[PDB]
Amino acid sequence: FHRVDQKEITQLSHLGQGTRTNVYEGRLRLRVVLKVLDPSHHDIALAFYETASLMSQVSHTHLAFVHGVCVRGPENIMVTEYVEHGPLDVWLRRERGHVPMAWKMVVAQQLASALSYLENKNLVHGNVCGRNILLARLGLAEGTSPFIKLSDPGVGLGALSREERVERIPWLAPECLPSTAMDKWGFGATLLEICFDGEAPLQSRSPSEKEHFYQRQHRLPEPSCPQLATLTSQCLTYEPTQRPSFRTIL
Amino acid sequence: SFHRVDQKEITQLSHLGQGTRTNVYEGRLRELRVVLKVLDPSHHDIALAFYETASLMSQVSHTHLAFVHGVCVRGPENIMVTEYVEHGPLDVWLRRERGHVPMAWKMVVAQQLASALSYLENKNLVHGNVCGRNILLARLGLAEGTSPFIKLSDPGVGLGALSREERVERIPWLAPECLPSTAMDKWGFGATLLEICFDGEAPLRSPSEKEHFYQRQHRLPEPSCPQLATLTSQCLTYEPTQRPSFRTILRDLT
Ligand SMILES: CNC(=O)c1cnc(Nc2ccc(F)cn2)cc1Nc1ccccc1C(N)=O
Numbered sequence: 157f158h159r160v161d162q163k164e165i166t167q168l169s170h171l172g173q174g175t176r177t178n179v180y181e182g183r184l185r186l187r188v189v190l191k192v193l194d195p196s197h198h199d200i201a202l203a204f205y206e207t208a209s210l211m212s213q214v215s216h217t218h219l220a221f222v223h224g225v226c227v228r229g230p231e232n233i234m235v236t237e238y239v240e241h242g243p244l245d246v247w248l249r250r251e252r253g254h255v256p257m258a259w260k261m262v263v264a265q266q267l268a269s270a271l272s273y274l275e276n277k278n279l280v281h282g283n284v285c286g287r288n289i290l291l292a293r294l295g296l297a298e299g300t301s302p303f304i305k306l307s308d309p310g311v312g313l314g315a316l317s318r319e320e321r322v323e324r325i326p327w328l329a330p331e332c333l334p335s336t337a338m339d340k341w342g343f344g345a346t347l348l349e350i351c352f353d354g355e356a357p358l359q360s361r362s363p364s365e366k367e368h369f370y371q372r373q374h375r376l377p378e379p380s381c382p383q384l385a386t387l388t389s390q391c392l393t394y395e396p397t398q399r400p401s402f403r404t405i406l
Numbered sequence: 407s408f409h410r411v412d413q414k415e416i417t418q419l420s421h422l423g424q425g426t427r428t429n430v431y432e433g434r435l436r437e438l439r440v441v442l443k444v445l446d447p448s449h450h451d452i453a454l455a456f457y458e459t460a461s462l463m464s465q466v467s468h469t470h471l472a473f474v475h476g477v478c479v480r481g482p483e484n485i486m487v488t489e490y491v492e493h494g495p496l497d498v499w500l501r502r503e504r505g506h507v508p509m510a511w512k513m514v515v516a517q518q519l520a521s522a523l524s525y526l527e528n529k530n531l532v533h534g535n536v537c538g539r540n541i542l543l544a545r546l547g548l549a550e551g552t553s554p555f556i557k558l559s560d561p562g563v564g565l566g567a568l569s570r571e572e573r574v575e576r577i578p579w580l581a582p583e584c585l586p587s588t589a590m591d592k593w594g595f596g597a598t599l600l601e602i603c604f605d606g607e608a609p610l611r612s613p614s615e616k617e618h619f620y621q622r623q624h625r626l627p628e629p630s631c632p633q634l635a636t637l638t639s640q641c642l643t644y645e646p647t648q649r650p651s652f653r654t655i656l657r658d659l660t
């Protein structure tokens with residue numbers, strides 16, 4: 157990745173928080189988003205640099221751009237693309253009950269296209285969820301279509317604690333609780349989240365209840381949209397090898 | 407004239423901005439995404455000028471003119487239900503993108519605006535409120551890379567119903583002969599080309615200073631873009647009859 161000097165960036169409004177990060181709007185000497193990692197252990201910083209490296213070596217219409225990394229004292233900052241309308245799950249909740257099925261199907265194909273590209277290069281995202289799908293275009297006007305970008309996955313999944321992995325249920329693949337196959341589960345859980353207008357299954361459950369659900373191999377709900385019922389059931393199987401490829405899904 | 411929309415058919419969503427005696431909101435029409443132009447509580451003569459705009463826009467059809475769905479009366483509020491475009495007003499977008507809007511992009515917008523105005527001129531219809539704020543971006547042409555697409559918004563409350571103070575606030579888009587005809591839209595068009603060339607920074611100042619500028623017949627700046635210098639000078643002439651027709655302007659833009 158490219159090294160960004162702190163003199164080149166300006167930090168502005170707080171947008172949200174990610175795993176061990178704070179997300180801000182900023183400027184790059186361009187409007188950008190700064191993902192500021194908390195003062196962390198070197199294993200976390202390394203997992204953060206690996207994500208920056210991954211995202212800097214890939215290029216796809218539906219993957220967000222990474223400008224580089226800035227080290228500012230104990231803070232590691234990923235300088236990333238600012239996407240106009242921000243996270244999908246937030247927008248879906250605000251528009252609940254008024255998002256058509258045809259709109260949701262365009263998003264699903266766009267996400268599957270980004271993930272087919274990653275699968276073809278044997279690259280793992282590991283954090284596919286509605287919060288990480290950014291809306292570049294809303295597709296609300298007649299004769300327009302939405303346009304998404306999959307955000308970077310942030311701190312790599314391998315560096316997170318068990319508690320953080322439990323917090324990621326139901327997007328977390330069950331084999332990760334104790335491969336590219338994990339993104340098929342994340343994709344399936346995100347399609348459920350989309351079908352339910354940004355209300356993910358198991359959102360009102362405790363960490364203990366979420367861990368129990370996976371330990372007993374309980375299966376996530378069938379979506380309310382019949383067009384994605386078979387696809388989600390095939391993606392949300394506990395046996396990773398039985399999940400379909402993104403070429404097939406797409 | 408226009409379709410009547412019952413308030414049960416509309417949902418009022420987020421505030422987008424304000425126009426002359428109006429508040430603009432995003433909305434839904436039973437669904438389609440729309441924009442609701444909510445007129446302030448007004449006298450009957452102001453409401454009538456608002457209905458006249460709704461009637462005008464409902465009787466015309468052009469790919470670069472915004473569609474009007476109809477009018478809803480909600481207590482003392484008159485609401486024009488209009489077409490929603492994804493990216494909003496041109497002047498706002500230009501200021502945010504200042505310094506990286508190429509000249510070829512600005513020329514597509516100019517041709518598209520001249521096309522809408524040639525259509526109105528051919529029907530002897532006056533817009534009276536051509537400005538960057540009223541040019542709506544349906545497409546930026548950036549994600550797909552294929553060029554912008556605009557819609558000229560409705561003119562809102564008819565210019566004839568506004569006060570002198572409101573007309574002075576509309577300088578430099580206001581034609582000077584309107585301070586105390588389709589010719590007025592050439593001036594508005596010319597002032598909008600300047601505004602576009604300057605990345606949404608229009609020329610001109612206090613109301614008194616703007617009124618003096620017109621009283622002394624001072625001429626607006628020459629644009630920084632040499633491709634539109636002659637066209638703007640011809641459109642921004644104080645003698646209305648000396649302004650070129652939109653048929654001519656539209657052929658010159660090719
Ligand atoms: C790689 N780039 C991004 O992740 C990114 C790009 N554009 C954004 N626009 C935006 C626009 C309006 C608004 F109100 C909020 N955000 C937000 C972004 N991140 C987030 C922002 C907040 C919470 C989570 C994320 C995240 N998943 O990182």
Ligand SMILES: CNC(=O)c1cnc(Nc2ccc(F)cn2)cc1Nc1ccccc1C(N)=O
Pocket residue numbers: 422423424425430441472473488489490491492493494495539540541542559560
């Ligand atoms: C006839 N239809 C319209 O005029 C109209 C259509 N679509 C819009 N989309 C949009 C999308 C995102 C956003 F941030 C803001 N706007 C804005 C519109 N009006 C305006 C909105 C604000 C201020 C003035 C006008 C105006 N000139 O009336």
